Design a protein around this ligand. Structure first.
Ligand SMILES: Nc1nc2c(ncn2[C@@H]2O[C@H](COP(=O)(O)OP(=O)(O)O)[C@@H](O)[C@H]2O)c(=O)[nH]1
Ligand SMILES: Nc1nc2c(ncn2[C@@H]2O[C@H](COP(=O)(O)OP(=O)(O)O)[C@@H](O)[C@H]2O)c(=O)[nH]1
Ligand SMILES: Nc1nc2c(ncn2[C@@H]2O[C@H](COP(=O)(O)OP(=O)(O)O)[C@@H](O)[C@H]2O)c(=O)[nH]1
Ligand SMILES: Nc1nc2c(ncn2[C@@H]2O[C@H](COP(=O)(O)OP(=O)(O)O)[C@@H](O)[C@H]2O)c(=O)[nH]1
Ligand SMILES: [Mn+2]
Ligand SMILES: [Mn+2]
Ligand SMILES: [Mn+2]
Ligand SMILES: [Mn+2]
Lengths: 371, 370, 371, 370
């Protein structure tokens, strides 16, 4: 087989997270691509060099090396600094180097099992007739696969309009052909919920009790970039969306992977591919966060997400591969930006989609340059 | 001979009077309905219909309201197209000398026949009674209810205190207390913030914890949905004017959050107390875009924890509620300059300064009629 | 010859301006297209019907008729209501009806001479070797053609960075081939200056003393939509830009024709065509304006205009006609939006260009539908 | 024996002292240089160099400034990274008992040897003298200069009064007056707003109109670039804190526009007057992004006309400048609620309320040292 895996992590830490992250990746021979930023100290580079001598295929390109690559691809202004958007550099590097699997992780996610890399290789099994999970309302709650206290929760990016009636939705499973290209692993401890839910019930994920599922066409669930494997064919549609666009004068943040998770998902289903949820599960002791500041950052995107998701269901895409389908998606977002209505759809909210669509096509143009 | 006046501001057609009048009419209480510019003519016909049925109801037109406010040299204090107009009802009940002022919304219905009698507890006077204290200085009134699917906190409860509140020690002992504010509870949709409602959509099944009187140093937010205020404490119960931007985002839905805390801090300075529990109302809350509620509440939520912490460091002065409320207004202006944090932009600080002026404009009008 | 002219005016007035505007248009047989809005009272329709019986070819389509046409062209959300942007409806109608000349006017511009329509027909003379005016700094001040008190002024939309050194620029005239397709007539009384200049010196235009000029390639001057003739071939690039986009949280306004005037100008010079300034001159008793409110509306666009104009000079366009060249221009604006730098270039400022570019291509798509 | 203290706040390297020290050193005046956090160490070396040459110059570090402001219970009054820090120099000169406080910028250079002597006019006391009045209530000080290419108005002059000002009647007659503020004029780049500078780029060639003393009811903006204030009037000369948003846009560059009008309205209430004319300085203004200046000035320009009109309707109270300035602060809070217009959003009104508190915080600090 010889399935190559590259893990992508962007960080501003001192590199101490490598002590618990390297053994699972070293034993599998996977490559770790660490993306530092301008606000990243020199202790990270020393930590990578130490773990490299311990047998870890780790690379940590300086911002000078990153900017050289991005300048040669005619995209010097695509990826901003002082931002976790720089993980797109690791996406690009792994794709250029021909890795089969690109595993997006954060610097505070720790694998809980020895088969972490092997479980993420499921995005390489190809099309198979397999149990496929469908929902009557078109949504799946991946947090229902976990034991969560003190009450049930939905993942960050799950639409709010669908949450009340989701308990009455019918969940069915049947044997159908499917081609898994995205694998969203779950998380113990602090699950990936939005700031609203974390401020309200402070959820704690005890265990992974529901197994794994593969979602049918028409059944969606948000996908984050914290513990997610993407097959190299689907990576062109996995661009981490640039944040900072104001919605009614309030800049949005923390939703770069909410859009990327839905975008690669809509593109995958158009191409007959599927998204998987379940193992491998990581432990998430989330970084120290001002929850009221997280809330202030997430609300601008939360006010628009339900309308964007509804219009995406009514807009069929075109394309024969992920590059074409992602570009078709960018054009569909611009049409949605002018057709959608609501109090939150101020002129700057509509312009957010138009600028995002340009950046999406700037991302695809860079991939076409190396290809 | 205890007199009660119920204050409700509304833009509805008046249909809520059918289920609200019987409990008020049987007790002989006055209902003061405050219409707005966006209030249709059907409300006035509904008030006239229930008045002939024996209900002491008054519904002053916006012209009569503005004439009264001009005579008190406050023509710009209370805006239109806003539930801030309930302040007009507060003022009228106070001018007419009512003992109890019950603040209600047009979608709260009493569940018992003794609704008015239970709210009269703000007239009992000082006596040694069971008083509830908390080690962290906060009491969760929603813990007095059976709520599904999980425990919630009331709207306006500080967020920094919520995680460690489960480990707080709650104690009760016989101490002198003088109840001047009675916040009645609510079944159905409880008064939680938009954050909690978006997350768990709570449902209040029953009132199971009884009633409590909070000790000095133990606080809990008081809303204006089902709350009796004794006439002495009414000057400090001014409904705060919303619309001030915090980082360019105008705040809303927290006018009674500040008023409930302000009357509470003033009452404890004067040796008075706040009660929580009965009488309980049924709350089928009006339709609400919850994401819009969230957008309206976040600006105030970002400042409330800091404001509450500083209010504990600032001793007040005053011999009555008018003097203590004015002393509070000056305390807010000092806090506005000493507080620090990411959310404390120049417009956030200026929000406290303009609020302080409006508080003293409210007290100035009360001193005019008095 | 038989040169057909259609005058386009959008208004919310009662139609009294027709008493002094109709005779100059009736005597020339030109068509007047009045574009009402939702905030336009019924007295305007009665005024048009009265002048129609007096011999004026005037049409005043209701907003129901306008929305029907725009819906059939698959652009129901392009043109907003309660906005002078609705003059685009008159642009479209005149273009559909095959008029040679489209004269954009406001409801407070009155022709001062009997040859008003004939002078605007200059955009139909075709290519000729004629005196062409060039400037060493690349800018021409059309207000220098007027007698203005109490001091010299620049027109609204003239870049501010070029104003100090413009007095040292060399102006030269020589016989060169040129093809005039846009004719910007001048204005007496209150000239078209920005709110900054009007608040500062309150200029008064006494007379037109400088004659007319035809600008060379590389020499630019802003063109407004108050007294401007556009040949039907160049009209596709004359779309009135939609205002309301925030710049640092402040919505821009009053610059819809500043962008359209520069856009049709850049497109015309790419196609070897030219812009003319001078006669016919109108009288402008400007409507009552809160000058401080005009200032508050214009500053957001003024903060970006100099940078946009500078980058447009460094970006060569493509296209064989105005439709292709305008679409090429829209793509160039999106590249400029990401390359430009400055304190005023917040995320919403950059997104203003991206949404404008989409609306420009939505405009061209509607023209391609009728064509 | 009249003592003069010059107040300059700067972030430069101190090179401006070479052309500023001779006129100040020959007069024995004190120069109080106020550095900021963004001030390099070269300024302190330049002050020490000119001190050995005979100049009475002091340059307190930010630590010494903050220690003094803590002792006066105003640690949060004056922000850093702002020319608002000139208020520290105002305070120090007032504490040290100087008769004349001359407010200057680090790019204003005296053109004559009698610069300090001319500014001493704020010490002459009351006397019958030629006093200039205007029928519209405004005087254009730039009309005292030869300006090209066209006539301009000073920064802070109201815009609604500019068109009809040419028809205003200007008269002069012998009346008692007591000059307490002397605004010296400026050659080169005159003090116009960004609107005027962007439009005509004025150049002031000479001072040709002499000097004038304005009558009661005739106003003209006073800046802090070349202005002497008598120590009695100094309490009302507090440099207003900028940064408050007006419709989400923070205001700047108008701190001395409000201070110049505030000290002026206070002075006339106490029977004192403002003088315009000599001594004139040369102004090679520092580099400025003019479109950025415009963006900073528009928020204040949108409110100034309304504020000035209402200040004429509001009689002040007070026996000295401290009491009159505090009375002015309360007048601003009443205006903030009575004024109407498109630019008067909630944050615009709250701007006046926070400014009023800061004014009383300034006066409270002065009452502490006194
Ligand atoms: N390059 C870069 N990465 C950042 C920056 N700030 C945070 N990150 C990374 O972003 C990743 C995800 O952030 P995290 O706090 O775990 O997200 P959350 O758990 O969903 O709230 C972490 O691995 C951080 O190291 C930054 O300024 N630059
Ligand atoms: N005067 C006035 N009252 C209003 C307006 N809008 C709402 N209200 C009243 O405000 C009261 C409280 O509102 P409500 O929706 O019950 O608040 P919630 O239950 O906490 O979400 C209701 O009784 C309404 O009648 C308005 O525009 N003007
Ligand atoms: N359709 C429409 N036209 C408008 C509206 N407001 C103004 N106009 C028109 O816009 C045109 C130009 O406005 P004008 O005040 O003359 O611009 P200015 O002289 O450059 O300041 C006028 O003919 C107005 O009739 C509106 O709300 N809707
Ligand atoms: N303390 C302090 N002073 C400053 C700062 N920026 C500017 N200044 C001072 O403010 C004074 C007036 O500024 P200036 O550019 O001359 O204003 P203008 O001539 O009206 O445009 C100058 O003397 C500067 O030294 C700052 O960040 N901190
Ligand atoms: Mn994390
Ligand atoms: Mn309610
Ligand atoms: Mn006009
Ligand atoms: Mn200066």
């Amino acid at each position: 087989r010889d399935i190559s895996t590259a893990v992508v992590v962007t960080t501003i830490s001192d590199g101490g997270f490598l002590d618990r992250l390297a053994p699972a990746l070293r034993d599998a021979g996977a490559r770790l691509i660490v993306i530092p930023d301008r606000n990243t100290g020199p202790a990270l580079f020393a930590a990578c060099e130490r773990h490299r001598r311990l047998g870890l295929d780790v690379v940590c390109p300086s911002v000078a090396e990153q900017q050289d690559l991005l300048e040669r691809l005619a995209v010097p202004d695509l990826i901003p600094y002082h931002s976790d958007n720089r993980r797109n550099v690791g996406y690009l590097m792994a794709w250029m180097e021909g890795f089969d699997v690109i595993v997006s992780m954060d610097d505070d996610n720790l694998p809980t099992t020895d088969d972490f890399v092997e479980r993420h290789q499921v995005v390489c099994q190809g099309p198979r007739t397999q149990p496929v999970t469908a929902s009557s309302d078109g949504w799946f709650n991946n947090c229902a696969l976990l034991e969560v206290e003190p009450t049930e929760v939905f993942p960050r990016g799950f639409p709010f309009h669908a949450r009340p009636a989701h308990a009455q939705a019918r969940t069915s499973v049947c044997e159908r052909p499917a081609d898994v290209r995205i694998n969203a692993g779950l998380w113990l401890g602090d699950p990936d919920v939005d700031a609203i839910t974390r401020l309200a019930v402070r959820p704690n994920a005890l265990a992974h009790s529901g197994g794994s599922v593969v979602l049918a066409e028409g059944t969606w669930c948000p996908v984050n970039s914290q513990n997610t494997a993407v097959h190299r064919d689907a990576l062109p549609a996995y661009y981490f969306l640039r944040m900072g666009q104001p919605v009614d004068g309030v800049p949005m943040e923390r939703f770069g992977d909410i859009f990327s998770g839905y975008f690669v998902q809509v593109c995958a289903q158009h191409l007959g591919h599927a998204v998987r949820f379940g193992d491998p599960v990581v432990e998430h002791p989330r970084n120290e966060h001002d929850l009221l500041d997280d809330l202030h950052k997430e609300v601008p995107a939360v006010r628009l997400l339900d309308d964007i998701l509804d219009h995406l269901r009514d807009h069929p895409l075109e394309g024969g591969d992920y590059l074409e389908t992602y570009e078709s998606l960018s054009y569909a977002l611009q049409e949605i930006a002018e057709r959608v209505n609501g109090r939150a759809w101020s002129p700057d909210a509509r312009a957010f989609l138009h600028r995002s669509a340009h950046l999406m096509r700037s991302w695809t143009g860079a991939l076409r340059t190396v290809a």
